[PDB]
Design a binder for this molecule. Structure first.
Ligand SMILES: Nc1ncnc2c1ncn2[C@@H]1O[C@H](COP(=O)(O)OP(=O)(O)O)[C@@H](O)[C@H]1O
Ligand SMILES: Nc1ncnc2c1ncn2[C@@H]1O[C@H](COP(=O)(O)OP(=O)(O)O)[C@@H](O)[C@H]1O
Ligand SMILES: [Mg+2]
Ligand SMILES: [Mg+2]
Lengths: 656, 515, 33
């Protein structure tokens, strides 16, 4: 192979190459324009080491504290039906909606797999909204809490247009911790310094900065606790209450054991109360530690009261629900509420005990915040240019591979040298005529008709020294062009003033009578079977100038009919009343009709389809004719088209 | 291949090579002369360590303090409409204008994307100026502050000529910090000393030194709540763009691309280049006609042309080849159109006529023949009218004025050219003419396109093909020869036409004037 | 040997190839579930 070949192949397949490259580049464009952007925020902290501090920042205690502070276990996402609706909304300049939610409690179905309950909220106006979990529709109002059907929800400052939908998921705490940890990173940048760089990536440019600020504040507060925790009585205060709290816990367990030795609503309310009691407990402990280290008018401090206000109102209505319940169920719940709350608060005190101990051994001087977290407005993902470049290069590489594949899988004839190497004379090369009528009559100036005239002048010389004036056209495979070539060649030889007879000896699928305008009665079959005379079968072509004999009715025994001596009698008779006789035949690989006819023909030519047939099929057809005692003069390549890879020049261009 | 071949190819393509390299060099020089210069300023700090210190210098607190001090969030850009106007203005020696603005507040449109509000100020004089944000035109004066339409602005010391325009942008604080951080670098220079080198790059030689001084002062003051050895100075020689390396890369790139393009053009030619290619196949080349740089016969207008000399050489070759021919009919044909068959035939007829022999030229290109145009004509009764039977043999023969030979024009274009030529009247005409003339030359259409030449060649004693020098390939000529042979016509040989001088050829013609 | 021969062999033996690969994938799915 050489460079000319590959360049020609590329030029020939240019449309396919362009299509494939364009489709991959379009997909890369679509992805790099619809993938959700990802922003990144960072902060800088000063430490007076730094190897264990890196591990302590990514511990579950710090992250859990910040999640509880910022209430990150309430996942809110705008509803778009397709996997591209969000991208379309962003490109159209539409402002994404957002809702501030401060209290959520789903009924917590908590089946085997779906551990994350979720509801859908539809915005009806600036104030009210609709809520549906599994078709249970409820109406809610911003401001006032909703506590119905074991569902608690508080919605504040709806900022969206009416008709929008939002999915609200209440995912478990560990899931939130894992989600945050996946996107959070810590570094030293110097491997020795007291400088810490914190990094956080996420899709909301403000939420991530708030989260990173909360993490920094929690770390600073935790580490500087030792400054005044040494003299703080809380340590002993923990040492005092902890044995005591266990005492009623044991009592609560034993009493429940005594009574034990399943109402759906009761456990639904029981858990909700237990959650409310928990929410109150750490909130007071949270509100405790905020009080020393912050001011009452500070926005964090003011926040806890309405949160405390919210919890108490929820509990109060919860107590209303219990009071409306039978005392038989109420008795169990009071035992259960005591057991659950006591066990829950016991763990919390153990947690708080463990937390303060770590502050004791914290060697770090205190903390210092050099740079509070800020977010880079230019997203870090997706990286558009690299995606586009990869898409284009991938398109090119797959196009080249596919085209080279098709090149190495090609077997059809491409140029007459392939036939001429075997030793087959190619007498013509007919191009495709892009123009039930004879081409040589409808459009006499077509390129294919010019090539056929070239064939005519070749034949006028080849058929000299012929045994007689009979020419048989055949082929290897069907629909190679035998009827086309034969009919048009007859037309062109007739227009030169010689009498021509065309015989459609394809008794199986011959349609020449259709293409000439016909009297289909008394074709060739009716003559051979003996029920017609030699004069009733010859008909005149209208736009031609030559006679023809049609096949007639399809016989059941085509091959055996052609062996009747009447066929040779007909040929010998016609050879004295005409200058040329052209016989069209079925293929030779399919049936044996052509080999029977060829015994009576002075000249025989094969037709090879340009791209379909292969060299071997033509060779095999030549051999099969030879074994039956018929000498094939040569071949006619038909259906040629322009291939830049050829480097073979035809005259298939207009000259006039 | 050898070195001589490639040197010849380079010499031949020298025009393209020089043009491409010149274009690349011109772009390199324009870039190296129009890119805005970038200066470097530096300072030296002593630390009484230094690993955290590079991180503390590049912190947002220090840079933010400097930015607030120097109002680096007020970006002023002198307005030049093109992406090169600033470069020309600098090259033309024009002094760049500048404005001192000490307090600025735009209404902060703050849409989804354009977080950077900006206005345009046009200088009217040394005192007053015009301001436009979105078509809102206002007039202000240096000195007195302006508080109008949510736009508040104070200008001091406009230093420019009237008519100038300036873009004033109020970009966000973080954007300014990031921009400053891009241009600011800290290095240790000893990896152990308390010495730090601070570096800052920028386009204004004085502003960057002031900025670096502010950074050093803010750092030093912050630490004492660290020693400045060398305050910031600006190197007057710009560090970018590096002109000489840009120009060298441009030149080398030009040479590389020129050479590679020449290698493609060499490897992608297929045309004939010398008669040796045809003679490898076994085709006699009887002549090689060069391009004649000079609606008239060349062999009459400029009888001393080089091409006519080559044609005379062909004439003497023919006078020997055409002996023992079955008659005195010569047919010139070719592989592809516009190869030169009409040119060769007509001029050859002229040169054979000037030697005192009677010559008949038959234009048997019944499809695109124009010989009668080139000879001066009575276009009535061409060859078509004779073949179709509506003219006799004696009304079709015409006399060339400046020639000395007769001709037969095609006549009206018939609808069935190839079928006409099969009529026996054609052979009757040739038999009659062969007894009244010394030589008959027949011009024909190409053979790959139509089949007329193969019909005519049966009655021609000699046949010759014409191949254009660079256009046709060896394959086309071989195919044409085989197609003629299939139809029973023996081609004597070939004629290479349209040659030009190629240094890479290493094959020498005699195409030079001698006289 | 050439690419055409091997491609033809795969095309002819497609029934066996598909059957074997499907059996192995089915066992993989059963184990994975
Ligand atoms: N060079 C060609 N250009 C345009 N149409 C062609 C060409 N060769 C064959 N055909 C058309 O394609 C079809 C197949 O050719 P046909 O001779 O009828 O089949 P078969 O060779 O088996 O007898 C026909 O409709 C024919 O008209
Ligand atoms: N060696 C040549 N020098 C200058 N002009 C030439 C030469 N050969 C051919 N031509 C001109 O180029 C054009 C094409 O040649 P022409 O013989 O008319 O076409 P065709 O080969 O199809 O008959 C003509 O205008 C001819 O005058
Ligand atoms: Mg057929
Ligand atoms: Mg011509």
């Amino acid at each position: 192979i050489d460079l000319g070949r590959v360049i020609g192949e590329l030029i020939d397949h240019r449309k396919l190459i362009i299509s494939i490259t364009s489709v991959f580049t379009l997909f890369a464009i679509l992805y790099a324009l619809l993938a959700t952007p990802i922003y990144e925020t960072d902060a800088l902290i000063q430490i007076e080491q730094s190897a264990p501090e890196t591990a302590l920042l990514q511990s579950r205690m710090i992250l859990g504290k910040t999640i509880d502070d910022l209430n990150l276990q309430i996942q809110i996402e705008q509803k778009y039906f397709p996997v591209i609706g969000r991208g379309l909304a962003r490109l159209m300049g539409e402002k994404p909606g957002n809702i501030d939610i401060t209290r959520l409690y789903l009924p917590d179905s908590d089946d085997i797999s779906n551990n994350t309950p979720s509801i859908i909220l539809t915005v009806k106006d600036k104030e009210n909204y609709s809520i549906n979990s599994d078709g249970i529709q409820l109406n809610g109002v911003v401001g006032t809490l909703l506590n119905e059907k074991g569902i608690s929800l508080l919605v504040n400052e709806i900022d969206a247009k009416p008709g929008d939908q939002f999915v609200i998921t209440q995912l478990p705490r560990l899931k939130a911790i894992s989600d945050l940890l996946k996107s959070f990173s810590v570094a030293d940048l110097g491997k020795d310094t007291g400088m810490l760089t914190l990094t956080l990536t996420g899709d909301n440019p403000k939420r991530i900065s708030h989260i990173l600020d909360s993490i920094s504040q929690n770390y600073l507060a935790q580490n500087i606790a030792r400054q005044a925790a040494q003299d703080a009585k809380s340590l002993e205060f923990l040492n005092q209450q902890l044995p005591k709290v266990r005492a009623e816990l044991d009592s609560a367990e034993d009493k429940l054991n005594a009574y034990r030795k399943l109402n759906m609503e009761a456990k639904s309310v029981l858990d909700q109360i237990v959650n409310v009691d928990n929410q109150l407990n750490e909130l007071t402990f949270r509100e405790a530690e905020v009080s020393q280290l912050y001011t009452k008018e500070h926005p964090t401090y003011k926040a806890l009261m309405e949160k405390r206000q919210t919890l108490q109102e929820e509990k109060s209505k919860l107590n209303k629900r219990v009071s409306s319940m039978p005392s038989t169920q109420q008795e169990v719940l009071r035992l259960s509420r005591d057991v659950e709350s006591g066990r829950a608060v016991y763990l919390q005190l153990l947690n708080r005990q463990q937390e303060l101990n770590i502050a004791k051994s914290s060697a770090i001087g205190n903390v210092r915040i050099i740079d509070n977290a800020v977010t880079d407005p230019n997203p870090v993902r997706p990286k558009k240019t690299i995606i586009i470049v990869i898409g284009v290069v991938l398109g090119l590489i797959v196009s080249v591979v596919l085209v080279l594949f098709q090149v190495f899988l090609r077997r059809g004839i491409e140029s007459p040298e392939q036939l001429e190497e075997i030793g087959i004379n190619v007498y013509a090369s007919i191009p495709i005529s892009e123009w039930d009528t004879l081409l040589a009559v409808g459009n006499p100036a077509d390129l294919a008709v010019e090539a056929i005239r070239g064939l005519r002048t070749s034949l006028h010389f080849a058929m000299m020294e012929a045994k007689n004036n009979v020419l048989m056209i055949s082929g290897a495979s069907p629909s190679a062009g035998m009827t086309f070539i034969s009919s048009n060649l007859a037309a062109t030889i007739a227009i030169t003033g010689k009498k021509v007879l065309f015989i459609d000896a394809d008794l199986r699928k011959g349609y020449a009578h259709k293409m000439f305008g016909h009297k289909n009665d008394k074709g060739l079959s009716e003559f051979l079977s003996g029920q017609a005379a030699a004069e009733m079968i010859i008909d005149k072509v209208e736009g031609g100038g030559f006679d023809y004999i049609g096949r007639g009715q399809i016989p059941p025994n085509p091959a055996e009919l052609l062996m009747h001596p009447r066929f040779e009698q007909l040929l010998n008779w016609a050879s004295q009343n005409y200058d040329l006789i052209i016989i069209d035949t079925p293929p030779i690989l399919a049936v044996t009709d052509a080999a029977i006819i060829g015994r009576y023909a002075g000249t025989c030519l094969l037709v090879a389809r340009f791209e379909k047939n292969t060299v071997k099929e033509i060779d095999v057809s030549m051999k099969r004719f030879e074994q039956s005692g018929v000498v094939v003069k040569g071949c006619i390549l038909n259906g040629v088209v322009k291939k830049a890879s050829s480097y073979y020049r035809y005259g298939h261009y207009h000259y006039g």
